[PDB]
Design a protein around this ligand. Structure first.
Ligand SMILES: COc1cc(-c2cn(C)c(=O)c3cnccc23)cc(OC)c1CN(C)C
Length: 119
């Protein structure tokens, strides 16, 4: 049993994950695979945590999910240097994600979500 907001967040989530076919951003970055990551990135974020926040109804607006998505890409652009494949994939993912999470699309969903309340 999910609210219209939760289901809209999951559809956007699945569309965002299709822009990351390499699964670079599907799971948290550990210190084991990236030394000093916990000491450099103060607010780590990844697709798995965002999906967990959706299922626990932690997200309030699509904008909050969009803020986490921006944080996810910018984190990779701080820890990784501009030549790295992680930096370049994060830059491309962020740009694609901003078109998906555009104010135009966030709006069509806000109306449909609202129309599913108050009968
Ligand atoms: C959690 O798992 C993975 C994380 C990364 C990964 C991501 N980001 C954003 C980074 O900045 C990063 C920085 N240094 C080293 C690694 C990463 C890469 C993976 O493989 C290439 C896997 C493993 N498979 C799921 C694909």
């Amino acid at each position: 049993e999910q609210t219209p907001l939760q289901e809209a967040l999951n559809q956007l989530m699945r569309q965002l994950q299709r822009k990351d076919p390499s699964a670079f951003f599907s799971f948290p970055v550990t210190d084991f695979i990236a030394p000093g990551y916990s000491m450099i990135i103060k607010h780590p974020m990844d697709f798995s945590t965002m999906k967990e926040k959706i299922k626990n109804n932690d997200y309030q607006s699509i904008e909050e999910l969009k803020d986490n998505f921006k944080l996810m890409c910018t984190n990779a652009m701080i820890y990784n240097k501009p030549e790295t494949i992680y930096y370049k994939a994060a830059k491309k993912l962020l740009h694609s994600g901003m078109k998906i999470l555009s104010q135009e699309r966030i709006q069509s969903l806000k109306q449909s979500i609202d129309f599913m309340a108050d009968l």
